[PDB]
Amino acid sequence: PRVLEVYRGVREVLSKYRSGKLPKAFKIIPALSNWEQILYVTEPEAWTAAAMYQATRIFASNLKERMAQRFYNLVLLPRVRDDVAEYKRLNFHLYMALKKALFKPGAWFKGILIPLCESGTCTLREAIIVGSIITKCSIPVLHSSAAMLKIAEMEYSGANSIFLRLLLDKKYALPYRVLDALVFHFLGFRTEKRELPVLWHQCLLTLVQRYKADLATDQKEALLELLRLQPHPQLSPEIRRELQSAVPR
C-alpha cells in the first residue's frame, strides 16, 4: 500500500547507487516480519555492486543466521555466478561483499560453499576466487572441519579439490573422523581409471606435508599404494619421500 511507494523509491535508488548514506528503511530490513516481500520489491537483481556489498554488510550485522543463510542462497550466489561467467573476474565491491559474508561463517558455509560445490556446475575460476576468499578469512576450527567433512563426503569434481587444498592450507588441528573421511576419499581414487588433474595431486601433497604426524601405518601404506596405482612423474616422488620421512603420533 503506502509502504510500496517508499520501497519502490529506494528500489530506484539502489539501481543507481554508488556510495553515500543509505535510506534508513533499508537498514531495518532484517527487523521486519515479511522481509522476503520487501526484498522482492527492492529487486535485488537490479542492485549495483556497492549497494549489494552494503546490503550484505547490513544482513550480516543483524544476526539471525537463517535469514542470512537464505539471503546468501537466493541473492548473492546467483549474482556471483552470473558475474564470473560474464566478466571472467570478480568485482572489488562483490569481493568485499563475500568477505563481509564470511564475517558470519555459519551462514556462509551452508549458503555459498556447500551449494556451489554441491551444484556440480562450479567452474575453475569460481573455485579459485572463492577458495582464495576462504584463504583470506580466518575461520573457526570446528566450522572448517565440518566443511572439510562435508566436502570429503560429496562427489568429486575438479573444483572440489581446490577448496579442499585451500582449507588444508589453513593448517589447523583436525578432528580424526575428518581425517578418516579424507583418507577414505583418496582411497576412493584407488581404482579410478579417470586421469586426475594436477590439483588433486597438489591437494594430496599438501595433506602429506601438513598431516603426516597424524597418519597411522595402515593408511600410510594405503596412500603408498595410491601413489603406486596413480603415479605422476614429478609430484609422486615428493609425496613418497614425505611419507617415508614422517613420524606418527
Partner 1 sequence: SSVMRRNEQLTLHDERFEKFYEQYSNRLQEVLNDYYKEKAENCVKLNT
Q: Where along the sequence are the contacts to RNA (CB under 7 A)?
A: 20-21, 23-24, 27, 57-58, 60-61, 63, 89-92, 95, 102-105, 128-129, 132, 135-140, 169-171
Closer to partner 1 at the Cβ: 2 or 88? Answer: 2
Grid cell of 96 as nine digits: 568485499
Q: How far is the CB of 160 from RNA (least distance, A)?
A: 18
Sign of CA dihedral 184, 171, 146, 53: negative
Instruction: Choose which of 30, 35, 175, 210 interacts with partner 1 (CB under 8 A).
Output: 175
Instruction: Compute the distance between CA of residue 156 and CA of residue 204 in angstroms, rounded to an integer.
Output: 14
Tabulate helix, strand, coil % of the chain (nearest 5). 70, 0, 30
28 binds, among partner 1, RNA, none (CB under 5 to 8 A by kind): partner 1
Cα–Cα nearest to 159, from 110, 115, 192, 102: 115
Q: Print the binding letters for residues 10-49 with partner 1: x by CB under 8 A, - otherwise.
A: x------------xxx--x--xx-----------------
Q: Answer yes or no whether residue 184 interacts with partner 1 by CB under 8 A.
A: yes
Measured CA to CA, the distance from residue 178 to residue 195 in angstroms comes to 25
Report in angstroms how near the CB of residue 171 gets to RNA at its nearest. 5
Beta carbons within 10 angstroms of residue 216's beta carbon: 13
Q: Does 214 bind partner 1 (CB under 8 A)?
A: yes
What is the distance between the alpha carbons of residues 213 and 77, in angstroms, rounded to a whole number? 37
249 touches, from partner 1, RNA, none (C-beta below 5 to 8 Å by class): partner 1
The single-letter code of the amino acid at 201 is H
The answer to whether 190 touches 225, Cβ cutoff 8 Å, is yes
Residues that bind partner 1 (CB under 8 A): 2-3, 6, 9-10, 23-25, 28, 31-32, 109-110, 142, 145-146, 149-150, 173, 175-177, 179-181, 183-184, 214, 216, 218-219, 249
